[PDB]
């Protein structure tokens, strides 16, 4: 009978609205893909059902339309959460890299300070080995001057490790929520923190290491892009939000029209 159709029509709509529901969420690619497919398939089942009912003297032209508007609207939304999903993936990858790069710089900085600290200790320890008919003053004065230079490089490195950690934390602090509220602040904030890190970068002793820090710096300098990613993400998130409210009225009209047709079927059935 035609009654078995109304049950499927209700069912297709329950799964459609359910797929459309899950799609607009979608945390991972897998869910997005799976739900988009399901939505498409359900829309196809509804179209086939409507065409079956229509050739039963039943009128489906109001539902055919609404359902078509809804499929168009969800296509767009599906696309948008698709791009957004990508962005949120790029943000993670890029940020992952920047902290790693900042952390390597900090580690390289600590390494350098340790070398100077170990040297100064040796030199100073050397001043006490002087007692050996070795005219102190000549040596003592030179060793002392050497320890002061070592210690001076320690500060320079400790200041490098710090500049690097500052930036690492700032990046670890981005999250859209705050990139939205205080955006220009967080930005000009990192520009200095990075322009500083760069300044101190070009001040490393052995250019061999001053080189690795140079490559790492180029990676951390992409923070400006990681910012662009977060922006686009919010330009879409608000967008997707707007459409999510239009759905209410659309979905209200659609389901309400299914009910009306299902009735015309459970009433004409007797």
Swiss-Prot record:
Stretches assigned to the Periplasmic side: 1-270
UniProt-annotated location(s): Cell inner membrane
Description of post-translational modifications: Activation requires a sequential transfer of a phosphate group from a His in the primary transmitter domain, to an Asp in the receiver domain and to a His in the secondary transmitter domain.
Taxonomic superkingdom: Bacteria
Subunit field text: May form homomultimers. Seems to interact with TorT and TorC apocytochrome.
Purpose: Member of the two-component regulatory system TorS/TorR involved in the anaerobic utilization of trimethylamine-N-oxide (TMAO). Detects the presence of TMAO in the medium and, in response, activates TorR via a four-step phosphorelay.
Protein name listed in UniProt: Sensor protein TorS
Species name: Escherichia coli (strain K12)
């Amino acid at each position: 009978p035609t009654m078995n159709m109304a049950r499927q029509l209700s069912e297709a709509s329950a799964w459609e609205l359910f797929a459309a529901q899950n799609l607009t969420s979608a945390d991972n690619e897998k869910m997005w893909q799976a739900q988009g497919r399901m939505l498409t398939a359900q829309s196809l089942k509804i179209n086939a059902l409507l065409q079956a009912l229509r050739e039963q003297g039943f009128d489906t032209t109001a539902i055919e339309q609404q359902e078509q508007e809804i499929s168009r609207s969800l296509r767009q939304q599906g696309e948008l959460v698709g791009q957004r999903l990508q962005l949120r993936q790029q943000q993670q990858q890029l940020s992952q890299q920047i902290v790693a790069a900042a952390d390597e710089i900090a580690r390289l900085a600590q390494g350098q300070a340790n070398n100077a600290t170990t040297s100064a200790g040796a030199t100073q320890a050397g001043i006490y080995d002087l007692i050996e008919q070795d005219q102190r003053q000549a040596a003592e004065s030179a060793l002392d001057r050497l320890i002061d230079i070592d210690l001076e490089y320690v500060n320079q490195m400790n200041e490098l490790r710090l500049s690097a950690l500052r930036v690492q934390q700032m990046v670890m602090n981005l999250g859209l929520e705050q990139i939205q509220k205080n955006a220009p602040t967080l930005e000009k904030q990192l520009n200095n923190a990075v322009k500083i890190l760069q300044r101190r970068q070009i001040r490393i002793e052995d250019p061999g290491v001053r080189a690795q820090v140079a490559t790492t710096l180029t990676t951390v300098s992409q923070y400006s892009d990681l910012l662009a990613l977060y922006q686009q993400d919010s330009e879409i998130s608000n967008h997707l939000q707007t459409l999510a409210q239009n759905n209410i009225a659309q979905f209200a009209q659609f389901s309400s029209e299914v009910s009306q047709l299902v009735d015309t079927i459970e009433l004409r059935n007797q």
